[PDB]
Symmetry: C3
Subunit: 242 residues, 3 copies
Amino acid sequence: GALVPRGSHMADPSLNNPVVIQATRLDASILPRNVFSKSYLLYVIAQGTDVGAIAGKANEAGQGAYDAQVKNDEQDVELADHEARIKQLRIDVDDHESRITANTKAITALNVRVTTAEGEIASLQTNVSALDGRVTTAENNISALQADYVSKTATTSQSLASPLNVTTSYSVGGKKVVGARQTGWTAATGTANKGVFDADLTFAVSDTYTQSEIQAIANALITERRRTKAMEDALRAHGLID
Amino acid sequence: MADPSLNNPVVIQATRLDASILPRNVFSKSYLLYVIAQGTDVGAIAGKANEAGQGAYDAQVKNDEQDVELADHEARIKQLRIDVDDHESRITANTKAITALNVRVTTAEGEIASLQTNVSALDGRVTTAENNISALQADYVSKTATTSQSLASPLNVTTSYSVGGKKVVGARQTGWTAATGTANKGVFDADLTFAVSDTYTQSEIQAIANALITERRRTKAMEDALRAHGLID
Amino acid sequence: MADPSLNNPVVIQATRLDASILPRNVFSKSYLLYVIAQGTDVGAIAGKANEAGQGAYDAQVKNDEQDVELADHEARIKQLRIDVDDHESRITANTKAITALNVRVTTAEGEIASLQTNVSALDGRVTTAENNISALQADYVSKTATTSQSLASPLNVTTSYSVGGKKVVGARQTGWTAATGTANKGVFDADLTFAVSDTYTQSEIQAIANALITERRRTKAMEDALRAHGLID
Ligand SMILES: [Ca+2]
Ligand SMILES: [Cl-]
Ligand SMILES: [Xe]
Ligand SMILES: [Xe]
Ligand SMILES: [Xe]
Ligand SMILES: [Xe]
Ligand SMILES: [Xe]
Ligand SMILES: [Xe]
Ligand SMILES: [Xe]
């Protein structure tokens, strides 16, 4: 019961109902021959022919009007279908317009973030590269130190290709053994002795003088002060005393 | 457009035949019936022609209404076609750009991944480095530390050992013959004095001799010690 | 569907009725005009039926044209529906992809920020290591260096000190009693002969005794020296 535009209505079937002339075809023999002119006699029969023909035309026009109407009804159904489909497409397309506009803007936004990221990556590679070179270098210096340093914990003897100077003292076993050079010494004149020497030499001594005895005493002293010159020579050569 | 003439019915120049206006005794009976029947036929035909025109008029009025709706469909469809083709271009472009971003992001993921492995490895190397370094700092001999330093091993040096800058111990001294006898490391008074009298006194001499023997035995003890250290051969 | 026959008029052979072929007094008042008027309304009904026909024909020709447009509109709507659905699919896909990329890029930037911190921290640890290393290089005692090396601290070793491979200093020799008295580090003379006697006559054996004292006093001084260094008790 929706819209009823003027002039609209489905096909009117009555348009097909034919008018049927009920008058019997005119036979000249029923006409007034004495009283009607010949021209009027011809006119009456002619007008009789026309009435019948015009009825044919009117019936045909009605039929043609009906076909047009029936076709209109069918095109109205199609127009309505077309109308529904267009309205839905317009809605679908309007929805797409927005989603496409948002996608395009999300793409532009992603590009900025990736371009930034790319920059950070480039620098990170630069920093890691350089770092690698420094680590390799430090690592070489380390192993180089490890093969050349003196260990406080090594148990096997270690040697130095150089002389050594220490502060205030040397010790072994935790006991001082050597210190600063002992000064205040005057060098011993004379000829040192390092040859044979028997510290268990006895000296006989009698009740009366005896040159033999006393000589062996002063000589054992000479050989003694001399070996003492020797020991001193050795201690000064090292540097333990002045 | 709809022809208005179609809706205007025929105006009959006038009818109203009643059969009392007809001439009697001039028209045969038949022609009489005919004239009345043709009267009603004309009537029925005038109406059929009017109804047909009205039917043709409605069809045309409906055709006009449909031409208007068709015009509207045509415009909306061509505009939808413009909008959809436009969308086609933009969707295609958005799609290709996403593909281009993926190649870049994928490339970036590959570098981030290798960076991670590299830093991870670099991490292992540095720790190992710090550990070797801490070990050294705790086990090397410092030329600068003041606190006494201990070596758990024997030491061997070249040329000499100094303290405060003065040479103290050099190379072992050779040219020695081992002194024989029994060493004396006990009591020894360097201030031991002696009595020398005018006349041979056996006791006084013996004293000297005895004190000489002790002195010689302490000399051997010192020599033994020096030799034991290695200062002399 | 347009039927052209609809446009073909019914020609009524019009010879319009007059009072020139009509009977001279036979039919009355009404019937006279009624036949004149009927001749006119028959001609009018004919015109109306003919135009109604023409109107039906025009509506049909128009219907045929509208059918052509309806089909064209039908085809274009069908194609647009396909295109719009194809677009629905692809747009949703592009939207998915963008989202998927967003999680990847978001993840990546989290990793990048993490690498920047680690690399930063690694730089700190590497710098410190390089500093500890340069400190060691300047402070360690080398086993290969030739120039003399100096320690600011005392040295302690185990079992012995050597020089040139030969032992020179070992553990402190113990068991010594310290010699007492005055130490003599003054002028000495290892070779100062002693003229003896003959007959004991010539007392002065004071020389032998006096030289025995100086000797055992210099022995005491050397002993002090050894004990001061630490080589003996
Ligand atoms: Ca139509
Ligand atoms: Cl899109
Ligand atoms: Xe008619
Ligand atoms: Xe050392
Ligand atoms: Xe030493
Ligand atoms: Xe003596
Ligand atoms: Xe990225
Ligand atoms: Xe390092
Ligand atoms: Xe070191």
